[model samples]
Target: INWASGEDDHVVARAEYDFAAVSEEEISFRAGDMLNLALKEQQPKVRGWLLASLDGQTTGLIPANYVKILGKRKGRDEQEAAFESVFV
Candidate 1:
């Protein structure tokens, strides 16, 4: 998952997830592992994403409501991230 600046201008904080190459054993597969898992696994391939956005421009840590696990086997890939924003 990736979040891009809606405008062509630079975005203050941009994040992307690349679980396509991570191994099953390397992944933590837990809620608290959101940023760490992404960072440890995808760092060399990507950078500069924030772990939290508490000041209000973005949301806070781990939006539990949006977490989802896909795939049916150990080696399959999964997508993870906090809810982009609140709905209520």
Candidate 2:
């Protein structure tokens, strides 16, 4: 994804996923897969990450906006998240 500055004058972060190595017949990811993220724009006050459960049944605080897939199952749904600044 692109993280270009917008003319509205607000902070924004973007992420992109690469699934070229993954195949449709095979599981794109397994549980416990290592997920790494790098911040293009700095936000010192941002706390926690944003995520969405693709299956819609996941609960609790997911480690990061991105997750490492675990388990051996293929076709298991997944989730995703994003980050932004926080004010207390």
Candidate 3:
């Protein structure tokens, strides 16, 4: 991690919610999806003010309360552990 965050950091949507863009500047999302949430200045006046990188090329305001940490890394251990389980 850097001295700052919201650049390469991310989180998960805890529930399903949809938003309609009032104009061309806004974006939308769905549940269990990953969001790019690295912002430099969050406007407290703005409810849920994180920069959502929808395609790694767009920005939108998303509610922070609906977000959860899912450990952005789909790393070594968990990937292998799942295949060994009966459910898989």
Candidate 4:
């Protein structure tokens, strides 16, 4: 698995299309499947690829362009830093 830093707690994404694993480190998923992104734009082991998990437990690598993170998109620094201003 291509491990990345950080937990994508708010970065759930959906598969835009079917993706078949091209390597042992990748996971095969179909379109319409909701996945939990494993990283939140932290340090990545590989560029253009992101770590993802299904069912909150099973995890593997996925193409960055293949899945779209839901809701509003934000810059890496902005997205990470924006959370601090929220009130619980």
Segments in model 3 whose C-alpha atoms lie over 4 Å from true places: 1-16, 23-25, 39-45, 71-88
21-76 in candidate 1: lDDT tens per residue?
Answer: 14322221243232311222322331322233222234223322223322111111
Go through the candidates in order and give each one's C-alpha lDDT.
0.25, 0.26, 0.44, 0.61
Flag the better candidate by TM-score, 1 or 4.
Answer: 4
Q: What's the C-alpha lDDT at position 66 in model 2?
A: 36
**lDDT-based ranking:** 4, 3, 2, 1
Instruction: Sort every candidate by TM-score, greatest first.
Output: 4, 3, 2, 1
How many clashes does each candidate structure show, in the order listed?
A: 0, 11, 1, 0
Q: Assess every candidate by TM-score.
A: 0.17, 0.18, 0.46, 0.63
Report the lDDT tens digits of candidate 3 across residue range 28-58: 7666666554423332246554445555567
Q: Candidate 1, which segments miss by more than 4 Å at Cα? A: 1-56, 63-66, 69-76, 80-88
Candidate 4 CA-lDDT value? 0.61
User: Worst ten-residue run, lDDT, model 1?
Assistant: 69-78
The C-alpha stretches of model 4 lying farther than 4 A from their native spots are 1-10, 41-43, 71-88
In model 3, where is the ten-residue run with the lowest total lDDT? 79-88
Clashing pairs in 4: none
Q: Write the residue-wise lDDT of candidate 4 on 1-88 in tens digits.
A: 2221223233556799999998888888899997666445442577778777665556678887787666323223543443233212
RMSD of each: 14.2, 15.4, 9.6, 6.9
lDDT for 55 (candidate 1): 29
Candidate 2: global Cα-lDDT?
Answer: 0.26
Model number with the top lDDT: 4
